[PDB]
Design an enzyme around this catalytic site. Structure first.
Site, short mmCIF file in Angstrom:
data_model
loop_
_atom_site.label_atom_id
_atom_site.label_comp_id
_atom_site.label_asym_id
_atom_site.label_seq_id
_atom_site.Cartn_x
_atom_site.Cartn_y
_atom_site.Cartn_z
CG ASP A 191 -1.92 1.21 1.22
OD1 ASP A 191 -2.06 1.89 0.17
OD2 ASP A 191 -2.54 1.47 2.28
CG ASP B 291 -3.68 4.68 -2.47
OD1 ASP B 291 -2.98 3.77 -1.95
OD2 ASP B 291 -4.79 5.08 -2.02
#
Ligand SMILES: Nc1ncccc1NCc1cccc(-c2ccc3cc[nH]c3c2)c1
EC number: 3.4.23.46
Length: 377
Positions: free
Chosen positions: A34, A220
């Site tokens: 992440d 992201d």
């Protein structure tokens, strides 16, 4: 870095994960990769959805930090206990580091029923770490304690099972074609970048570029969608909608409230336009552009239990928090998070889904004036 090629797995929409070991002796866990968060957090109690969890009691090297973390978000949370322990990446660099770990002891709507991962690796910077910026993120500890260079790169492929590569400490030229082009990391918190122009087939929304980055734009890997601010999202679909007449379908589809469906293989890619984003370049008044295909923003929906058809979700959506270049964007490109030089690299991915028609592209240089005015302050 052939050791690392193909070291990522996943399921469509459930993110990409890498195998890690924690503790002594090593406990193996699958960990979501992440770039939009900065905590390393792993399940540490027998939540029923989990295949595995971290058992601090079995580790010589575990150290309690005697402090808790509580991480809320929209309709959910996780919380846990902070310690440190020894961490390694089997299909990564051949090193072991002492990293902060949030032992997740309680959570709501965090873990996914049916998923094959048990934690999260926040690869963003200290600023957005919880509870505060003194909790050193994993990658900062890795760089600090080893001779691993301060960067990593991601190739997210996918097309049930997805796959990919995370190259820690370098770049692998087999994962991309053409040249890498770099945008500055505007500030080290999220991986914030600046979008200076958007074209929706060859035509720009011709809107103030300050709007493309209100109040952020970020890269992201833990978000699936391309997510655009309302004001830009509106214009965006207004243009894609109008691009995609001679086609025919609803109103809630575009708000991601209802999926769209064609018969096995009857999907008309070509009434949907390519979408191009121009990013601030490395040089004053110089930009470059990345171009994604409908296949990137029209993603197959997996378990439609009430159907046996060819069904997709529109992978764009609105945001209060800014532009999010999620997996929809990333899957068309090899992305280099060149932290050493505060910049992010984009090249055409060797594994992206193209055809014999159109193709994901990275192109420059373009001349773009007043690019620094596109940043929100
Ligand atoms: N990357 C990111 N972007 C915005 C908000 C939070 C965030 N990361 C932390 C987080 C918090 C809650 C859930 C998830 C998450 C759960 C499951 C899956 C599957 C694919 N991506 C995710 C992200 C991430």
């Amino acid at each position: 870095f052939v050791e690392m090629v193909d070291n990522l797995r996943g399921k469509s929409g459930q993110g990409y994960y890498v195998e890690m070991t924690v503790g002594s002796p090593p406990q193996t866990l699958n960990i979501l990769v992440d770039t939009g968060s900065s905590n390393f957090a792993v399940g540490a109690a027998p939540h029923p959805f989990l295949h595995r969890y971290y058992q601090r009691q079995l580790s010589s090297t575990y150290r309690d930090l005697r402090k808790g973390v509580y991480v809320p978000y929209t309709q959910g949370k996780w919380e846990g206990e902070l310690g440190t322990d020894l961490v390694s990446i089997p299909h990564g660099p051949n090193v072991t580091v002492r990293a902060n770990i949030a032992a997740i002891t309680e959570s709501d709507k965090f873990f996914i029923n049916g998923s094959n991962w048990e934690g999260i690796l926040g690869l963003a910077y200290a600023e957005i770490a919880r509870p505060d910026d003194s909790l050193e993120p994993f990658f900062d500890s890795l760089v600090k304690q080893t001779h691993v260079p301060n960067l990593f790169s991601l190739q997210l492929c996918g097309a049930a099972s997805v796959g990919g590569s995370m190259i820690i400490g370098g770049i692998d030229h087999s994962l991309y074609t053409g040249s890498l082009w770099y945008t500055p990391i505007r500030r080290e918190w999220y991986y914030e970048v600046i979008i200076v122009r958007v074209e929706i087939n060859g035509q720009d929304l011709k809107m103030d570029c300050k709007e493309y980055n209100y109040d952020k734009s970020i890269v992201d890997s833990g978000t699936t969608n391309l997510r655009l601010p309302k004001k830009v999202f509106e214009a965006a679909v207004k243009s894609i909608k109008a691009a995609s007449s001679t086609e025919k379908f609803p109103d809630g589809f575009w708000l991601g409230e209802q999926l769209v469906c064609w018969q096995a293989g009857t999907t008309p890619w070509n009434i949907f336009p390519v979408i191009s984003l121009y990013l601030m370049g490395e040089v004053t008044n110089q930009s470059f552009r990345i171009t994604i295909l409908p296949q990137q923003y029209l993603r197959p929906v997996e378990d439609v239990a009430t159907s046996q058809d060819d069904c997709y979700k529109f992978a764009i959506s609105q945001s209060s928090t800014g532009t999010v270049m999620g997996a929809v964007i990333m899957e068309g490109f090899y992305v280099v998070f060149d932290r050493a030089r505060k910049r992010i690299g984009f090249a055409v991915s060797a594994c992206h889904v193209h055809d014999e028609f159109r193709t994901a592209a990275v192109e420059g240089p373009f001349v773009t004036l007043d690019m620094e005015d596109c940043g929100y302050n």
